[PDB]
Structure 1
Amino acid sequence: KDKVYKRPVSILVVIYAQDTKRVLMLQRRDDPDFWQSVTGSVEEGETAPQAAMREVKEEVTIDVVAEQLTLIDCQRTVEFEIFSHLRHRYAPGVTRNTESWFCLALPHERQIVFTEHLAYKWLDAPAAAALTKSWSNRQAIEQFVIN
């Protein structure tokens, strides 16, 4: 069958390096102008923290549980308008996405094995926040990386 619709309940994981404070930015394959932290749908049968862990593993091949890293629950949830040009992946009538925020500090920067994006960059947090098209991604970088 066709790829099932994305769910309008999602997670965001802001990955950064504790040592340099640079933020891991990833180039989307649907909109190559859209660089971002890790995002994805919370699927039926999983919780948001579980979705965050799965997506981090699937997208950037970092196993939070295996590395004994701390997946920080930001305890922030926002709602935003799905970008017009990306709405095609959601069910008919769906225009609003609800996103819950997490952060993940790696001890150092590392080379990244990415699977779903086109490219990655490690950027100073202001540069990262400035680059992303996502307002929520920007705000999460500002509040939980930059401070």
Structure 2
Amino acid sequence: VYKRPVSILVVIYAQDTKRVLMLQRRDDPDFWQSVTGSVEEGETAPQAAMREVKEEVTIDVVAEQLTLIDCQRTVEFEIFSHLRHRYAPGVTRNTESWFCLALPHERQIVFTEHLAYKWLDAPAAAALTKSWSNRQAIEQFVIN
């Protein structure tokens, strides 16, 4: 089923250490990222953010009474050529809404759709990802 060109980004980090959680994608093993996912029909960006966090990293924000911060930032970028196949014919642009999720500490992550995870300092995490929007969110909402 086609991914939708409306997505969310959840930058997860540790409040105490400020390290950022980076996940290794299965479709592009050189692509490390925060939590990302499409916004489904009839679902809001915050709803999709909490769903992806629960589906990808097994973190129930409602159960743990965590706070998903709406960054009130939306960006549009070109879908990577080698990844555009998952989108409807003709779709090349993707709009991404940013969210932040500050965990009290670093923790073991049980991922489902990624190959591995790694806690890195904000500058390192930003320099590691291939997504410029993911870099910008870490810099603007974790480093500063």
Verify same fold: TM over 0.5. Answer: yes
How far does the alpha carbon of each residue in 1:54-110 deviate from its partner, in whole angstroms, 9 at most, with x for none?
000000000001100110000000000000000000000000000000000000000
Partner of 1:12: 9
Q: In 2, distance between residues paired with 1:42 and 1:136?
A: 17
Q: In 1, distance between residues paired with 2:54 and 2:39?
A: 14
Q: In 1, distance between residues paired with 2:64 and 2:74?
A: 26
Identity of aligned residues (%): 100
2:127 corresponds, among 126, 130, 140, to 130
Counting matched residue pairs gives 144
Query: Which sections of structure 2, spanning at least 5 residues, go unmatched?
Result: none
How far does the alpha carbon of each residue in 1:6-40 deviate from its partner, in whole angstroms, 9 at most, with x for none?
00000000000000000000000000000000000
Residues 88-99 of structure 1: matches in 2 within 5 Å? 88-99=85-96
Point out 4+ residue stretches in structure 1 off by more than 2 angstroms: none
Q: In 2, distance between residues paired with 1:65 and 1:45?
A: 20
Aligned partner of residue 65 in structure 1, secondary structure = coil
Note the aligned Cα RMSD (angstroms). 0.3
How far does the alpha carbon of each residue in 1:83-141 deviate from its partner, in whole angstroms, 9 at most, with x for none?
00000000000000000000000000000000000000000000000000000000000
Q: In 2, distance between residues paired with 1:33 and 1:67?
A: 31
Q: In 2, distance between residues paired with 1:139 and 1:45?
A: 28
CA apart distance, 1:144: 0.1
Aligned partner of residue 140 in structure 2, secondary structure = helix
Partner of 1:64: 61
Q: In 2, distance between residues paired with 1:50 and 1:131?
A: 28
Q: In 2, distance between residues paired with 1:7 and 1:85?
A: 16
CA apart distance, 1:45: 1.2
